[PDB]
A paper describes a structure:
Metazoan Downstream neighbor of Son (DONSON) has recently been shown to deliver GINS to MCM during CMG assembly. Here, we used cryoelectron microscopy (cryo-EM) on proteins isolated from replicating Xenopus egg extracts to identify a double CMG complex bridged by a DONSON dimer.
The structure of dCMG contained 2-fold symmetry across the dimerizing N-terminal domain and was refined to 3.1 Å average resolution. Although no DNA was found in the complex, an extensive globular density feature, resolved to 2.7 Å, could be recognized straddling across two CMG assemblies. Within each CMG assembly, this density bridges between Mcm3 and GINS. Automated docking revealed two non-overlapping solutions, with identical cross-correlation scores, showing that the unoccupied density in the dCMG complex corresponds to a 2-fold symmetric homodimer of DONSON. We named this 24-mer complex dCMGDo (for double CMG-DONSON) and subjected the complete atomic structure to real space refinement. A second interaction involves the N-terminal A-domain of Mcm3, at a site proximal to that engaged by GINS subunit Psf3 in the CMG. In fact, by measuring the distance between the N-terminal ZnF domains, we conclude that the two MCM rings hover over one another rather than engaging in direct interactions. We detected an ~60° clockwise rotation of one MCM ring pivoting around two aligned N-terminal ZnF domains of Mcm2 and Mcm6 across the double hexamer.
Residue numbers in the entry:
A (entry chain R): 291 to 335, 395 to 471, 485 to 531, 541 to 579
B (entry chain B): 9 to 270
C (entry chain D): 27 to 199, 208 to 273, 287 to 303
D (entry chain F): 4 to 21, 28 to 111, 125 to 281, 291 to 306
Write the structure that this text describes.
Amino acid sequence: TYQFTVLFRAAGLAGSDVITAVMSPTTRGLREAMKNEGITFSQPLDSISIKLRKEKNEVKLDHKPESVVLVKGTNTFTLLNFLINCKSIVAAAGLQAGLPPTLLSPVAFRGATMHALKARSVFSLEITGPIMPHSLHSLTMLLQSAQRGSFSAGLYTHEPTAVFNTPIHDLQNCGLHPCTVEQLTQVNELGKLSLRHLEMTDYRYTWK
Amino acid sequence: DHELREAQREYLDFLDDDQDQGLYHGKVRDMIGSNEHRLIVNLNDVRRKNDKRANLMLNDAFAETIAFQRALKDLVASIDATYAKQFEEFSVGFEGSFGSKHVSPRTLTASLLGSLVCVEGIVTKCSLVRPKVMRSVHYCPATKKTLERKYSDLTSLEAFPSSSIYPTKDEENNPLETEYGLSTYKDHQTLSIQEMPEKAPAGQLPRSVDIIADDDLVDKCKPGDRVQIVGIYRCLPSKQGGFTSGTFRTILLANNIKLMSK
Amino acid sequence: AKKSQLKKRFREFLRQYRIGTDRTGFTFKYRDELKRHYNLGEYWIEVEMEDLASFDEDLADYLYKQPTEHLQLLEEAAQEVADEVTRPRPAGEETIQEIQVMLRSDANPANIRSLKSEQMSHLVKIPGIIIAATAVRAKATKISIQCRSCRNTIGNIAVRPGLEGYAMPRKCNCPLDPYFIIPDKCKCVDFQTLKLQESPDAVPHGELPRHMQLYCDRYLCDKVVPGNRVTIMGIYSIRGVGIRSSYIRVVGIQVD
Amino acid sequence: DYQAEKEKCKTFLQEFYKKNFKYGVQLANIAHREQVALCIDLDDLAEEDPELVDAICENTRRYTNLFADAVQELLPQYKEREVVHKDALDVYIEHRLMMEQRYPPELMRRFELYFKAPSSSKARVVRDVKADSIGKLVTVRGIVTRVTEVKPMMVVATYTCDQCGAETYQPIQSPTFMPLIMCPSRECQTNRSGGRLYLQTRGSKFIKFQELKIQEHSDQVPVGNIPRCMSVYVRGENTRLAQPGDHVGITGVFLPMLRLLSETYLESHRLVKMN
Ligand SMILES: [Zn+2]
Ligand SMILES: [Zn+2]
């Protein structure tokens, strides 16, 4: 969306056992709206004036990557319906006024449009566009054989999606390489941090 | 107007702070509960969420004020239709930090005309609170018809000199009777602010500025008070016979009166 | 018309005047000053009168005797030159501001008691001492009118400078005199009135000093406070049977 | 529908429980020229129908006339013992009728109708009478500081023209008026020359008038603020009922003065000398 980003994962990915969903920049009003709809989420990271003071501790990390919200189980279905019927997904004033949120996926779906990443070699090779983890893993797998296990990579990251690495704990037909499935079915080690430099020497990985 | 429509949309989006931290959604509910028709909008929030509107309001107060008032009316009608039906038009007052518009009666030049300013001074005189006419409802006994009419003057926004006040005859010269209980009236008061005596250059007389208060802004301060008025700065054209001297006087419409000493 | 020729001559004076000798170097004096003042935010210049005489004696002689129209043409020429010198202005400042021209000269000053009635509508230079001042009011320059009945609009009307008004039209082009001034569609400038008193030595024996009303506009406001000795350069003009009040439109002040 | 309102007022007037017909007896007295001031109390209306009470409280200008007309209609059916008076107006009317054989309701009217504030209504200070109570019914209290002498005020004018015999009428519903100059009678219009009619003071209608200023109690006034005043117009039997220096509580109508910004005055309806 133009304010927040969500990531739905299947059952088994990232060490989980049920379908999950992660919303990084959540606000107090949006969370309260979620509570009044049956969603059971869990953030892992004047008397009315006194109530505002209590909310001040709650409203400190809003609009910041520390307000990540994790939804699990069958609540993802109600989350989907709520997001479809929400009134703040589409901006009503500004440059992105009326534009619906963008959907990204590694496999085809109803209404999808096949796209391609731009590759250009200068030795160096440059690839631009929305890079998803399976694309990066496949690229590394190819370059390992092509470059005889010797290359270095510089990764530029989209900051508002770095908190998705927060730990949360039969995929043969998902349409992914078995090595990629094995890699993605691990436990998230990084926290609020993303890879910035990857180096491979003599078929050994030393990430920075 | 397309620009006015865009301003109205953006202001209505700003006011409906529901799925965000519920500040100005709670404020509107509080205003409705307390039976008021003026909302004090801090423009620090507007600048934080939409800087272009904040600057445009600081430099062109008239159209932006009209758009903001209409957006507030729409939001109130959304919250409660009957309350919106009670009041013809809602008012908006501003506060916060203005920047280079924080002036005094001495530094209030003629280049600030039409700009939302915030004047600091000490009151010197206040007039009496006399009523003013906005809408009059007439009735014709012969035809059993109820007539209505709207008035305006030059000392209000959307200024227009309106004549033929209190009509007495219909189209066919039928007698007309005015129903005073059905007409709408509002208060009116005139004040004067003076530059602080401690910050006035020696020898020269202190400067002054005349302000206009209306509705709930009347009887908010007395002579001898340190105040801080916020409102639009405008000229009053003067016409004598068929001639205009060209030396118009300046007035300061007010939308928020705040004391300092308290 | 001759007005266009006069304006072109004033523009040429502004663009081509130079000071210095070829032994050291030449520097354009008024174009550089115009650029510097416009960039600084001060929209005014101080044009001497001997320089204009040296460039074109006829042009100087038409300013000492018919100051109104020639000063207006000089101000328009200054605005055009200032617009062309800083042509690529930053975003938001495309519109060109109006320039005010102030005059100065080294002539011997006159006296208040020497102002005859022949020297009406002529540039004069009178010393004195300021004894009074008024609050800075507002004076309109551009006005727009609108009919009360048919709401026809006649905008961009110009009002002459000084204590002079504008007779409003009678026919609507809707009763007689249906036009009212739109409040927000008016451009105004600063406005002040002073009182100049004859110097303490020029006063004859056994007689009280005489006075004279002054008029100040735009950047000339709030420059002199009561009790200052000044030398005033201005236009003698008029504001019993046939008696008319006379004031002095000030176009230059030299505080002593 | 104002006709329905008038019928409801008549229905209330004829039948009043107490079933002592206070209104009926008083109207009979008025028809007998035994009473002039009739004070309708709003609590009885609240006993019957509070909607009419609210409606009359919102606009006490039309319903006063409605009550007056209802009383005027009910008057003829109570004149039992004819009349025992010697009114100059009645003598003038009688002689004019005798010449006629050979009329506005206000002209043929001598009863003044006033309302009483319901017990629910509460007294208000002078400062508390804002612009939102214009045309409503209010109850102010304060100290009278000045009273003027009673003077006659023209209500309806009665002109006569020499050319014709039809007397002209000119109601006066404004503080100022211009006297008629040319006679508009159809007899003069037929002559193509309007007669120079003159007003006959004998046949005109005059009412007692009094003006007084009411101030604010010093204790109620805030220490910093100065006391404020108010002008009250008193007409009819309510005249000569107050003197300067008396604490009073006045129930009346808040109205503007016309002659967009206007002054205000109070049309008194019931004056009580509280303490
Ligand atoms: Zn017209
Ligand atoms: Zn006649």
